Ligand binder design. Structure first.
Ligand SMILES: *[C@@H]1O[C@H](CO)[C@@H](O[C@@H]2O[C@H](CO)[C@@H](O[C@@H]3O[C@H](CO)[C@@H](O)[C@H](O)[C@@H]3O)[C@H](O)[C@H]2NC(C)=O)[C@H](O)[C@H]1NC(C)=O
Ligand SMILES: *[C@@H]1O[C@H](CO)[C@@H](O[C@@H]2O[C@H](CO)[C@@H](O)[C@H](O)[C@H]2NC(C)=O)[C@H](O)[C@H]1NC(C)=O
Ligand SMILES: CC1=C(/C=C/C(C)=C/C=C/C(C)=C/C=O)C(C)(C)CCC1
Ligand SMILES: CCCCCCCCCCCCCCCC(=O)O
Ligand SMILES: CCCCCCCCCCCCCCCC(=O)O
Length: 328
């Protein structure tokens, strides 16, 4: 016994003092220090706080601007909505949770918080997948006379939700569950226990395989052709340098996000994986809580790349904000 086990909780602290309670019933203040809790709640607000207005504003800009109807504007407007949903659904749940030191909103709270946070992170993954292939099709242009235009950009946003709901939602009904994490304040997938009546073994494997490994091999794949193209398979293709210049500033943007995603999300992925092998080992609440709350910048950083790296958007947004002169 290196923590505690219950119906729907695992608290990584030896109930040898009998101080350990459920994160649905009582304040887990015993798990560490008060200042550390209202430290995370102060970080949830700040996230909500740069997130809410930059994601809506992402939406607000694409809204007003009719020239933003391309593959790239689409996927990101999508992401803004993926982010905001974390901000309002997943985040306001965890915020409140940090300031009282437990899920007072009960198990159904641990759903919401953990759902959107699994959603916004996976949408972000699958969208990258779509992105990787669009750049593939538009730069490697490998199939016959084709157009990646307005129509596929709605097939793609619709594909990403499809495969984030394929991962985030199965714990809601009967395949694995959403369970408290580290300082218990954050909630995520049940890796820490078998719990056979939900199939937490099959779910996890799948969850990594389908919704981590695979999408990466595809994004690594689309990468492998673009390295090939720009070297010597984009020589005979004749693309005018003008076209390349701006289209490169659109290639780069994809992979920045590829990396940034992995930078905020590999710490998590790896830490989760590590528990799964060592089911019920010696470790502390501080272990998962860090790559957790950190990782939730995924509701913010995406727009921020789009703000920094894309000149067009940067001149659309600005133009919304003076109201006229620095359009679409
Ligand atoms: C970690 O250990 C603590 C204490 O070592 C557990 O709390 C204890 O929970 C039991 C079971 O609910 C309490 O016993 C109750 O006593 C009355 C006797 O009149 C009985 O009628 C009730 O039905 C119940 O059996 C016990 O008082 C309580 N101990 C105290 C005072 O701390 C705790 O549940 C453990 N953590 C978990 C969630 O595994
Ligand atoms: C709880 O954590 C402890 C580490 O503190 C682990 O207990 C080890 O048990 C194995 C036997 O398989 C021994 O090789 C080690 O001597 C133990 N370590 C210590 C420091 O006591 C264990 O992995 C965890 N779970 C158990 C079985 O209690
Ligand atoms: C995004 C992502 C994943 C989802 C992680 C989860 C379950 C997130 C949910 C809540 C969090 C991380 C709260 C903090 C997979 C499975 C790990 C692997 C890498 C990509
Ligand atoms: C904290 C996240 C940022 C997004 C919220 C921005 C909303 C307020 C924008 C006001 C900008 C004022 C610009 C006036 C300059 C001109 O002239
Ligand atoms: C509502 C909070 C989300 C953040 C989005 C910003 C909305 C505020 C409106 C900004 C528009 C700029 C107004 C023009 C200034 C004058 O001139």
């Amino acid at each position: 016994m290196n923590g505690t086990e219950g119906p729907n909780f695992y608290v990584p602290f030896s109930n040898k003092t009998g101080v350990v309670r459920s994160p649905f019933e009582a304040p887990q203040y015993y798990l560490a220090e008060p200042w550390q809790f209202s430290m995370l709640a102060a970080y949830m607000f700040l996230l909500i706080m740069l997130g809410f207005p930059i994601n809506f504003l992402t939406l607000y800009v694409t809204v007003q601007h009719k020239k933003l109807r391309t593959p790239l504007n689409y996927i990101l407007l999508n992401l803004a909505v993926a982010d905001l949903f974390m901000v309002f659904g997943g985040f306001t749940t965890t915020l409140y949770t940090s300031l009282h030191g437990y899920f007072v909103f009960g198990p159904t709270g641990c759903n919401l918080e953990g759902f959107f946070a699994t959603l916004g992170g996976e949408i972000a993954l699958w969208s990258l997948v779509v992105l990787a292939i669009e750049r593939y099709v538009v730069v490697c242009k490998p199939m016959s006379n084709f157009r990646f235009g307005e129509n596929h950009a709605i097939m793609g946003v619709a594909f990403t939700w499809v495969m984030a709901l394929a991962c985030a939602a199965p714990p809601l009904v009967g395949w694995s569950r959403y369970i408290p994490e580290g300082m218990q304040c954050s909630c995520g997938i049940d890796y820490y226990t078998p719990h056979e009546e939900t199939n937490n073994e099959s779910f996890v494997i799948y969850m990594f395989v389908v919704h981590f490994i695979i999408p990466l091999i595809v994004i690594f794949f689309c990468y492998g052709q673009l390295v090939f193209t720009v070297k010597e398979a984009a020589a005979q293709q004749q693309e005018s340098a003008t076209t390349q210049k701006a289209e490169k500033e659109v290639t780069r943007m994809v992979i920045i996000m590829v990396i940034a995603f992995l930078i905020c999300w590999l710490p998590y992925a790896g830490v989760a994986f590590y528990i799964f092998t060592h089911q019920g080992s010696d470790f502390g609440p501080i272990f998962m809580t860090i790559p957790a709350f950190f990782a939730k910048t995924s509701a913010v950083y995406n727009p921020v790349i789009y703000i920094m790296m894309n000149k067009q958007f940067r001149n659309c947004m600005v133009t919304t904000l003076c109201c006229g002169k620095n359009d679409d």
